[PDB]
């Protein structure tokens, strides 16, 4: 089952403040007129930005990487006193629910609890931190619009990758929206709240609001973005060639030369195989300039000059342009 | 005839320098090239107003 | 390592798969490390026997020739141009009309 | 001022500093 | 005392001091690490419980929320301006008049 997400979706991306004022931000938002996951189990769900949950009872939210106790896991279990938010190596059921005195899922930090009205709440998950957004609005989704206001972070650092959501016990179904990075326009108002908000990539009107920082325009004709196609596909086409480049005869070798009288090796009409350096020995510095030391399996060029000698040690940065 | 010039960079051809380096450097060598095409830019748009 | 970039017909770098053509379907592509945004398809240019890519007035890529099979292929940039919206005033009407 | 200007004028709506005319 | 550093967010930070109130008096304040140079006095605008500190149309700090009391402070930077002479031919006179 399918259902569209009119215009909900809306957080604040910062803590500062502007009265009246237009800002356009480029964050991890949620765009309109766009379908969530809506549910009626009574699974598990991949991730990659964006936890963002509404529902109409429900409680209990599972974090982690692969859910195991091979690494850490985030934790969160709601009732009517506080709220627990307890991260460590614990082990997860497939399926877990709650009953409201035993625990049937088998730092801290404590705080207010999160409670018809519409439960509303956004997760993110950037620079290692974990933002919480949430904002109860009383009433399908309801035809309106209102913002997130933002709550305590919880810093973990790990990475997230599968979520999973619980059960109550005394049955519900819940909303689940995935975001994408693009950018919008937020219109504060004179107390410091947002009641309007349009995007850039929708119909080429949000995109001249976009590109005019303005919400009524006046008739006329106006230039927003390019008209650059995307791609497709990618195509890449090489040479007939396979010779394995003498790239063991300049490394595995007894003896190569002096510092004052150093060889030159050429190389050419072969095709280089770099990934065959690591397997030789550790390097001590292989900092690189002009090239990266790590895609030289992309670029193409020709006529390589390979220079062999013997530095004692505390001169290997003297080996270098100038 | 300003996109060939090199200014003080490693090669004019923008695809092969992101192709063959990594962002810290790259972004040196990027920081020039869009300041030197800005450079000639704004001299071009000064001309033309 | 000493590397050089000179218009000069390129030989020694790594390994990657080839993948067929596309014809009026364009797409971003790369050959002998001069990638680029273009579609291909078959010139009329002829080519002596010692040259490998051509050039034109912008010094940019127009001809290359491919080492697979010796055969001549073009290098041009697709279909592009800034978009532009024809929108009456905000209270008059919805519907926008769009010109490329 | 006379009926007229009055009613353009009316209709006629960091270390930077904006000098005034004489 | 072992450190391991490049590995984690930095969450265990040195102390800081704090130092006392002003009023109508532009110094180089710092606060919570937002640095700047203007007064310090009683604002009439409302915030929200989750706002730090406010901004304007121009990108600058208007009004600053300490976090010691719940009242907000606005900022607007000091009487700055530029100085004119005005002053007769040398030939003629010697006094000079200042302009602000």
Redesign the interface.
């Given at each position: 089952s399918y259902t569209n997400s009119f215009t909900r979706g809306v957080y604040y991306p910062d803590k500062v403040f502007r009265s009246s004022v237009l800002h356009s931000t480029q964050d991890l938002f949620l765009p309109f007129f766009s379908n969530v996951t809506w549910f009626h189990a009574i699974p598990v769900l991949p991730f990659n930005d964006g936890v963002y949950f509404a529902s109409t009872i429900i409680r209990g939210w599972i974090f982690g990487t692969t859910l195991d106790s091979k690494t850490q896991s985030l934790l969160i279990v709601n009732n009517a006193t506080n709220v627990v938010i307890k991260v460590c190596e614990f082990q997860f059921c497939n399926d877990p629910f709650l009953d409201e005195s035993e625990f049937r899922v088998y730092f801290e930090y404590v705080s207010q609890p999160f409670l018809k009205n519409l439960r509303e709440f956004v997760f993110k998950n950037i620079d290692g931190y974990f933002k919480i957004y949430s904002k109860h609005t009383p009433i399908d989704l309801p035809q309106g619009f209102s913002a997130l206001e933002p709550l305590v972070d919880l810093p973990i650092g790990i990475n997230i990758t599968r979520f999973q959501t619980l059960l109550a016990l005394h049955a519900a179904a819940y909303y689940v929206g995935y975001l994408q990075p693009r950018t919008f326009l937020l219109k504060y108002n004179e107390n410091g709240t947002i009641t309007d908000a349009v995007d850039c990539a929708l119909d080429p009107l949000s995109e001249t609001k976009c590109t005019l920082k303005s919400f009524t325009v006046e008739k006329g004709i106006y230039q927003t973005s390019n008209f650059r196609v995307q791609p497709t596909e990618s195509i890449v086409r090489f040479p007939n060639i396979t010779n394995l480049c003498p790239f063991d005869e300049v490394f595995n070798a007894t003896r190569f030369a002096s510092v004052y009288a150093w060889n030159r090796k050429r190389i050419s009409n072969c095709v280089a195989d770099y990934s065959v350096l690591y397997n030789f020995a550790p390097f001590f510095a292989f900092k690189?300039?002009?090239?990266?030391?790590?895609?030289?399996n992309?670029?193409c060029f020709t006529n390589v000059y390979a220079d062999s000698f013997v530095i004692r040690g505390n001169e290997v940065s003297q080996i270098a342009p100038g | 005839?300003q996109?060939?010039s090199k200014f003080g960079a490693?090669?004019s051809?923008l695809?092969?320098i992101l192709?063959?380096?990594?962002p810290p450097?790259?972004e040196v060598q990027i920081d020039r090239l869009i300041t030197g095409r800005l450079q000639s830019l704004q001299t071009y748009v000064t001309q033309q107003l | 390592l000493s590397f050089e970039?000179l218009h000069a017909p390129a030989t020694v770098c790594g390994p990657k798969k080839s993948t067929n053509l596309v014809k009026n379907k364009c797409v971003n592509f790369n050959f002998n490390?001069?990638?680029?945004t273009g579609v291909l398809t078959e010139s009329n240019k002829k080519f002596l026997p010692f040259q490998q890519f051509g050039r034109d007035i912008?010094?940019?890529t127009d001809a290359v020739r491919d080492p697979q099979t010796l055969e001549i292929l073009d290098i041009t940039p697709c279909s592009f141009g800034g978009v532009s919206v024809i929108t009456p005033g905000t209270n008059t009407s919805n519907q926008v009309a769009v010109l490329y | 001022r006379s009926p007229i200007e009055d009613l353009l004028f009316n209709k006629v709506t960091n270390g930077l500093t904006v000098l005034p005319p004489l």
């Open positions: 690189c300039y002009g090239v990266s030391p790590t895609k030289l992309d670029l | 005839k996109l060939s490693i090669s051809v695809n092969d192709s063959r380096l990594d450097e790259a | 970039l490390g001069l990638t680029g912008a010094d940019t | -």
